[PDB]
Write a protein that binds this ligand. Structure first.
Ligand code: ATP
Lengths: 106, 102, 107
């Protein structure tokens, strides 16, 4: 009956060792990367967690982390477009409108 | 979509390295090679006088002209630093020194 | 039954479409295990990385009952260049030993 705990990582590629193909040498002993993986599965069966990962280089993610029962959903967040830019400016500029501080000219 | 633009000065070596076969098109950029062209370029830049231009045209009518715009600018700079009397003579002298013949 | 391994090398002048025909032949096999080791997916690597990648691909291929592996553009793969010549003897020695190794019994 426990609630839900969410842990957000970032640039998870940093905890990867499969990025040394192009003279990266950015992989420390796989031990460290094994441990984290065996915290999303193992003999223990945690049932009240949700892990959201974020990255910028999708090509250097260790492959053992993209299988069923593990992080198993990919999605892309592309650049904004005209309508998105309009809406975002409108959002960011609500204050001056709320106080008339913005010029009517703009 | 995508587009790629390349540039080089030694095409033969690239041809030998079987790299040209990768590209899809070629373009040429020739050097100035005629006297009238040189006079037109000088006119467009506008740095030489009327009698000066006439003397230059008289002396350069031989048609043995072959230079690169860049080096033309550098020679013009070098020449302009003399006194007004010897500018044209010195410039013609340097021009003559660089007597290339492709 | 007495020839568990087979090989074939396709060739032709540039831009004749060897890759497409190879892909079509591979696709029309109905085999359960297919792969294509293409150079593009190794840009900027070091010969050791190439060797390890090929090792892994073939190791995985060993685990099935039928398979098909299409190593495309062998020329570029072996870092060639006319002048010299130059290349990486390691990769050559690798592929040459690998193209003759039979899989475990019954595959
Ligand atoms: N019947 C066909 N036979 C061969 N190629 C075909 C045929 N029909 C269409 N094509 C097209 O021909 C092209 C062949 O490209 P492919 O990369 O296979 O050539 P390639 O010689 O291997 O290239 P490269 O020399 O750069 O490696 C593709 O666009 C393919 O779709």
């Amino acid at each position: 009956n426990s609630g839900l705990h969410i842990i957000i990582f970032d640039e998870i590629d940093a905890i990867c060792k499969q990025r040394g193909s192009m003279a990266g040498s950015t992989g420390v002993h796989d031990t460290v990367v094994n441990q984290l993986l065996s915290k999303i599965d193992g003999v223990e069966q945690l049932n009240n967690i949700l892990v959201i990962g974020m990255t910028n280089r999708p090509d250097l993610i260790d492959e053992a982390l993209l299988r069923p029962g593990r992080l198993e959903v990919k999605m892309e967040i592309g650049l904004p477009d005209e309508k998105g830019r309009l809406q975002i400016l409108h959002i960011h500029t609500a204050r001056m409108r709320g106080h008339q501080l913005l010029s009517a000219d703009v | 979509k995508l587009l790629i633009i390349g540039t080089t000065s030694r095409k033969d070596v690239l041809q030998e390295m079987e790299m040209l076969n990768a590209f899809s098109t070629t373009i040429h950029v020739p050097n100035i090679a005629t006297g009238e062209q040189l006079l037109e370029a000088l006119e467009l830049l506008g740095n030489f006088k009327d009698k000066e231009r006439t003397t230059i045209a008289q002396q350069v009518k031989g048609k043995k002209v072959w230079i690169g715009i860049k080096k033309l600018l550098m020679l013009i700079e070098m020449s302009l630093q003399m006194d007004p009397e010897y500018r044209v003579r010195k410039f013609l002298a340097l021009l003559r020194e660089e007597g290339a013949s492709p | 039954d007495r020839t568990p391994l087979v090989s074939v090398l396709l060739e032709g002048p540039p831009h004749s479409g060897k890759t497409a025909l190879a892909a079509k032949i591979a696709e029309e096999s109905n085999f359960p295990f297919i792969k294509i080791c293409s150079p593009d997916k190794m840009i900027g690597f070091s010969e050791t990385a190439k060797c390890q990648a090929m090792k892994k691909i073939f190791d995985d291929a060993y685990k099935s009952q039928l398979s098909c592996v299409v190593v495309d553009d062998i020329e570029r793969l072996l870092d060639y260049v006319p002048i010299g010549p130059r290349f990486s003897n390691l990769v050559l020695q690798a592929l040459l030993v690998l193209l003759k190794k039979a899989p475990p019994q019954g595959r």
